[PDB]
Amino acid sequence: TPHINAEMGDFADVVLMPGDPLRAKFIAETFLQDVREVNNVRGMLGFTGTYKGRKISVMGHGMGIPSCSIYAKELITDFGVKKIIRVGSCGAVRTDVKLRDVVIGMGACTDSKVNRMRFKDHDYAAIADFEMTRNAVDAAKAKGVNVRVGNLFSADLFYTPDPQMFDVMEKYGILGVEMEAAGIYGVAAEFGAKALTICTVSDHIRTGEQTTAAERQTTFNDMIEIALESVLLGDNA
Amino acid sequence: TPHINAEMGDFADVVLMPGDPLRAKFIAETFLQDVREVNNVRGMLGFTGTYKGRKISVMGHGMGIPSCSIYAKELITDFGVKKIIRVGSCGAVRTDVKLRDVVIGMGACTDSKVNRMRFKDHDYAAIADFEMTRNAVDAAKAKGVNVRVGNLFSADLFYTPDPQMFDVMEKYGILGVEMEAAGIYGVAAEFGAKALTICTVSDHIRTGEQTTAAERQTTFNDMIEIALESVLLGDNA
Amino acid sequence: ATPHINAEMGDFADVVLMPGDPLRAKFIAETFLQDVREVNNVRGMLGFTGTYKGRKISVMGHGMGIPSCSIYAKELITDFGVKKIIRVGSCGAVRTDVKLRDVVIGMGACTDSKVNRMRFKDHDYAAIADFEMTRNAVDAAKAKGVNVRVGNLFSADLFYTPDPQMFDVMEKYGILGVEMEAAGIYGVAAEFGAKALTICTVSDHIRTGEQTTAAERQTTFNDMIEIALESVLLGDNA
Amino acid sequence: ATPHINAEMGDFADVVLMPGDPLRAKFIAETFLQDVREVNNVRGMLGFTGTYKGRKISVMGHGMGIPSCSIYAKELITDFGVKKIIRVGSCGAVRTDVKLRDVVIGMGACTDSKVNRMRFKDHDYAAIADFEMTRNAVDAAKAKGVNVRVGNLFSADLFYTPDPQMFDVMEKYGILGVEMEAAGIYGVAAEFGAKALTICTVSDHIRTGEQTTAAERQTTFNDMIEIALESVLLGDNA
Amino acid sequence: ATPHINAEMGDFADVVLMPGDPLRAKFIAETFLQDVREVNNVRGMLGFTGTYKGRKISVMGHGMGIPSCSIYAKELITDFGVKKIIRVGSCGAVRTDVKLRDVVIGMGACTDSKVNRMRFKDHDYAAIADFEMTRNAVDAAKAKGVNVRVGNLFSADLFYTPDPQMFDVMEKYGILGVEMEAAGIYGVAAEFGAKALTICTVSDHIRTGEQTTAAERQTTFNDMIEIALESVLLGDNA
Amino acid sequence: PHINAEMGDFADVVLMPGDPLRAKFIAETFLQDVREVNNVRGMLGFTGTYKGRKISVMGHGMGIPSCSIYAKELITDFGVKKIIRVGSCGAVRTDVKLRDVVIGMGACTDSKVNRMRFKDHDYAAIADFEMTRNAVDAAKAKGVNVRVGNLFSADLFYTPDPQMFDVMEKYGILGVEMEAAGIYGVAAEFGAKALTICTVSDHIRTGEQTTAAERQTTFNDMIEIALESVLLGDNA
Ligand SMILES: O=c1[nH]cnc2c(C[N@@H+]3C[C@H](CO)[C@@H](O)C3)c[nH]c12
Ligand SMILES: O=c1[nH]cnc2c(C[N@@H+]3C[C@H](CO)[C@@H](O)C3)c[nH]c12
Ligand SMILES: O=c1[nH]cnc2c(C[N@@H+]3C[C@H](CO)[C@@H](O)C3)c[nH]c12
Ligand SMILES: O=c1[nH]cnc2c(C[N@@H+]3C[C@H](CO)[C@@H](O)C3)c[nH]c12
Numbered sequence A, B: 001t002p003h004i005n006a007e008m009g010d011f012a013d014v015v016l017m018p019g020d021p022l023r024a025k026f027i028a029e030t031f032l033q034d035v036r037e038v039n040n041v042r043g044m045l046g047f048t049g050t051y052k053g054r055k056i057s058v059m060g061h062g063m064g065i066p067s068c069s070i071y072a073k074e075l076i077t078d079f080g081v082k083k084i085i086r087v088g089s090c091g092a093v094r095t096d097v098k099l100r101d102v103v104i105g106m107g108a109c110t111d112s113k114v115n116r117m118r119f120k121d122h123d124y125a126a127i128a129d130f131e132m133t134r135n136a137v138d139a140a141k142a143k144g145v146n147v148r149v150g151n152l153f154s155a156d157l158f159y160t161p162d163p164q165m166f167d168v169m170e171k172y173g174i175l176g177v178e179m180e181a182a183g184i185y186g187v188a189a190e191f192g193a194k195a196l197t198i199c200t201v202s203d204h205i206r207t208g209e210q211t212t213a214a215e216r217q218t219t220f221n222d223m224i225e226i227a228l229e230s231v232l233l234g235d236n237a
Numbered sequence C, D, E: 001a002t003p004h005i006n007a008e009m010g011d012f013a014d015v016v017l018m019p020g021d022p023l024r025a026k027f028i029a030e031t032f033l034q035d036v037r038e039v040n041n042v043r044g045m046l047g048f049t050g051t052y053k054g055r056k057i058s059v060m061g062h063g064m065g066i067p068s069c070s071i072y073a074k075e076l077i078t079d080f081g082v083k084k085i086i087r088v089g090s091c092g093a094v095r096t097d098v099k100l101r102d103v104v105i106g107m108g109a110c111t112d113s114k115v116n117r118m119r120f121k122d123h124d125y126a127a128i129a130d131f132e133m134t135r136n137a138v139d140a141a142k143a144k145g146v147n148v149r150v151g152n153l154f155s156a157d158l159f160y161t162p163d164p165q166m167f168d169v170m171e172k173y174g175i176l177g178v179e180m181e182a183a184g185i186y187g188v189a190a191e192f193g194a195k196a197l198t199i200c201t202v203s204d205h206i207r208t209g210e211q212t213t214a215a216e217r218q219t220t221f222n223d224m225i226e227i228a229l230e231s232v233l234l235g236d237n238a
Numbered sequence F: 001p002h003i004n005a006e007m008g009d010f011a012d013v014v015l016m017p018g019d020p021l022r023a024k025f026i027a028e029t030f031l032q033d034v035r036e037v038n039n040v041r042g043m044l045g046f047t048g049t050y051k052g053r054k055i056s057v058m059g060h061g062m063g064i065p066s067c068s069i070y071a072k073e074l075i076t077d078f079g080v081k082k083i084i085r086v087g088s089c090g091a092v093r094t095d096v097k098l099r100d101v102v103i104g105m106g107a108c109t110d111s112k113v114n115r116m117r118f119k120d121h122d123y124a125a126i127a128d129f130e131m132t133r134n135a136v137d138a139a140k141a142k143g144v145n146v147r148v149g150n151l152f153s154a155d156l157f158y159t160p161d162p163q164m165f166d167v168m169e170k171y172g173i174l175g176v177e178m179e180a181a182g183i184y185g186v187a188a189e190f191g192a193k194a195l196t197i198c199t200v201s202d203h204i205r206t207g208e209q210t211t212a213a214e215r216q217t218t219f220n221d222m223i224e225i226a227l228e229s230v231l232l233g234d235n236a
């Protein structure tokens, strides 16, 4: 394809995907052994290595539902990928969610039309795989990292013309605003694979508190430990 | 209210709700001790008793999203109910789902407009509470009952003018078609409570197999054992 | 053979009155009809057949909301040969000039349900009653000396609506009562080639909170039933 | 004055018949009314006032389509005090049992326009006629010996539709005629607190392709006009 | 042979100027063309053909609103061989920097109609003009010394809108004028493989309340006509 | 969070491909005195001169949600007046061929973004007229045949509704890409100007495809046209 210049075999059966290809590089270099770069078309870096002896890939998916939908579809159909774990950032709308909290999207709401296009303009509930979600919760408990599990909201406009929607999201308990989960979940169902999104809170939409671009690139490590350990728990169940 | 003729305290903090009030009567009489009838307005029978010493209520919610939304809302706001477990029936679209299989709706798709009305016409992912879902999966393992966990589809028209939509549901891995879960999940989120739907497959939309009215009323009991045992798991943290 | 109705063909009259509440159906049958038999009780959704002034009449609950009544209406028509359904409901008022216990006739029913969009290529289906059944009801009310208003109902999906401002829009557009069923019954009647009408008694005022008791709703809205039954006789004789 | 009507208050009767075609309005005024004066001609949209059997009546074109007729109907109601509008239209049939020159009465009007969604918070507004006006029309037809059907019209935005399959849906749902205006007139009437009814003569059959000529539509659809005018007299007399 | 146009193939030029108002079409033809003949008068929708500087040109009313103009535009294209339509309309301004009598050129047209959703599987169809026709109009305006703005129109279905707040949105997004047709004409031109452009003169200012008279709209918006006619000659000579 | 540059680092005109490596190629190949001004998330951006005139080029990533972020921030935070997207697209018409250049006077879409801006009505996502004319005139001067008309900005490359391509073809859509309608909505929202010019990299019907290297470094016509169009705009 125009998007992935790898050969079949180059990816593991599980791929962790941040939006930022530079965070994918940092993740692979910091957590994995015997790392090879396996993709670089359009600068969208992907890598394969081992974590505690288990093959794991890590590859950026870019920002937004249309970008990540391409990469996730191709990994599943063209490279045999079974599980995708998005390891993202997100913005908090709830006053009881703080910067650097880790949130797990058992569901993802969205203002995109992509799932309506798949589902005859009805409401498709964009959900994670249950066992992957359980694995992540159990991994977080073993690492002593607090998590909340619930709904994300995958937005199409970061610079939204309707900020009042944040109040609606908050009323409905949305844990974090990001731009991808509902898309990845729709692709996973469409093409018969499994996915989960875990995010670290990088911005507070109410308070204005934020992290730097450097922090987002190299500093959200709890979520990656949880993600990797969750894979091992899923293998051994 | 016009729908419930009970006093606060008459209901437990957890209520199991089938659509059929006669199934509610059967559940209470068969599984609970010291049962009392606490509601009978419009014939929508509700009961309260104990299960292994633990206070539990069971009450009908009627058919369809508009019916069950009324009862779920009132139990939460007027009677202090913290958890609702819908114990329903459903129609299968998948070739690997059989009559009497028990399915757990971690999400519920829908063709209703009710969540759009709540959510500014965007896609609200109607999801169960994660811990209640985990409790149900764990209770099923302990009871030796096979389950599948994933998406239900809550339909507004049992007699649908669009049977092709079943093919779409199948392609997206929908485990069962019922008429309520998405509405119950929307209410639970709106009013700050927790819910889960567990259903027994009563019809197969592809094979044409159907159970009788009597079977639906009194024979789908694995789901009830799972529901009740899941409550006890939830209490024990 | 259906999961919803445990009757045999023949058990229902060609005209069925339908309240949402099966206990109201029981009260209607026992109060207004002779030689009554119970003909359905699956899911507690009581139905009955008797005679009114010698004419066969059935009365059966349809439950709350469009998805509930759609199932029962469809089955009565296709499986039991029912020609006419008259919903005999309650409703909540939004207009200042509509009062508790007024009787309102839904020539049309607006809705916030998606069911008619599903039937009609996502366009606007005008959910309307049968014209002659509507005329029969107006004439029967006139003959009884009971005032009625004839116009639009609004069939809501959420009794506990997250958008109460919509009641203002309903009032501005002259909606006579809010209930939860008419637009669904009208869509089923058109889909399956039968006739329907919804008549409702105002049981609540949505602006003021004025309310009737559960017992009042179940046994006490009699004018609408006399109007419904007499309207059937007018229709037979026309 | 508005850009659309160059008449003075008082120039219109409290009842206005409205065909889409200003030349049919001219025909109606010349053929059925006495003491006629022309009261509007802006944009060629001819309107007239005279008397029928002594009763003041106006007749004015509304143009083709919902956006055109919405402008005229609103202004007549709010600026000229009009109480009742009877659209006297043509329509295209989709049913086999509906034939050229049949008269149909639109107790409701479905639509593929977005205008009533704009008025009604994107829900389904059931665009309905006034009940008494409808009854008056049905009764007048009976007195004139003209067979009518009473039911749903479908008010299309696109005469040359990109979705002819929709006609099959219309036919299933018993749609009596396809025109382009009623649902818009009924929305305006409700919005601004007046009463309206649409009566149409079948001028095309969508299935057989048979079409009446322009001249036949302009000056030959007498039954619907006789029905409309007599229906007004019925409405006056309770 | 259509119900809407009583003309023969060849009666129309390959280019037709279309205002909404048939009386403006008459004024345009009589004022600007030589050897004029009337070629349509069905429904009072006057159409004419003559020459401009020796070049055959037609001018015909399209009526108010998308459904009206969609019928005439389609038939001109498919039945009379028309290749270009230039709508020469009026519009209402929402911007503070747009004044009465300004000429605006609609390289695009937004809309609240459902017609393009019906053509385009309920997605967003960008209703655009033909580029070269747009260029020709800009260049003709420069040659005629007439200031123009080129950008988006908004084609409304409800002149009497229940949502005046939308004007604030239009203004934010730079909408140059509110009219009722352009999006519909552009949708038909794309559907049937022809070319269109809408040029409008500001007749009302929605914020200041300034309004031109019916007479002004009919006969005084002539800069846009000079631009339209000269733009055709440029298009021929490219 | 997305751009690590100071005010003044971008020219008033920015060319934007989706591919940051194509941005690098454009800067290296067509501009002088180039410096890299952004690299956050790998989304490379550069500023240099074309025939003496200051010009920037920066990737926008794939899809409406990605490019809407970059375009917004360039306008509001970096004072950018004109954005010219220099993209690829897939053809659906039989008379549109690989390597053909197409100019999006308008962009249709299946995204909800403009509905969210425009009270759920139809916003006609259009280019700036003069930028469009400049590009057409520049193409004529370069002797490059262009078609000018509607693009279609898709949200799903791997669409579940391939029948829609038939509808696009009927309606004359020149190319399918994933960005224009979003960039045009942002430009209107924040009061700037934009145009999309694309090279056909795929034929959606025939299956003809250019390689990834071809997309990255061989679509020169559209770049020459974009840069020359800027000079025409300066001088008109
Ligand atoms: O405030 C926000 N709104 C929407 N998404 C995010 C995210 C998550 N990301 C990061 C990135 C946009 O900065 C896109 O991939 C989605 C962090 N903060 C926010
Ligand atoms: O085939 C089906 N379609 C939709 N729902 C159900 C259900 C679940 N219920 C049972 C009941 C309708 O029979 C309503 O409460 C939803 C079982 N089978 C089906
Ligand atoms: O305030 C109201 N909102 C909606 N419906 C009703 C009705 C009519 N019914 C009664 C019942 C809900 O109480 C449902 O079947 C529709 C009475 N009051 C109201
Ligand atoms: O075949 C049809 N389709 C839609 N409308 C009409 C009508 C009614 N009119 C007549 C006119 C278009 O001819 C417009 O005002 C609506 C007659 N025939 C048809």
Ligand SMILES: O=c1[nH]cnc2c(C[N@@H+]3C[C@H](CO)[C@@H](O)C3)c[nH]c12
Pocket: D003, E020, E063, E064, E065, E089, E090, E091, E092, E156, E159, E178, E179, E180, E181, E203, E204, E206
């Ligand atoms: O304020 C306005 N709103 C909508 N359209 C127009 C127009 C343009 N026309 C004129 C005519 C309505 O007066 C219809 O054909 C559209 C001028 N002013 C306005």
Ligand SMILES: O=c1[nH]cnc2c(C[N@@H+]3C[C@H](CO)[C@@H](O)C3)c[nH]c12
Pocket: A002, F018, F061, F062, F063, F087, F088, F089, F090, F091, F154, F157, F176, F177, F178, F179, F201, F202, F204
């Ligand atoms: O076949 C296609 N469908 C949708 N977009 C494109 C494009 C244009 N791009 C390239 C890139 C996806 O390959 C995204 O930025 C939009 C080229 N070919 C196609």
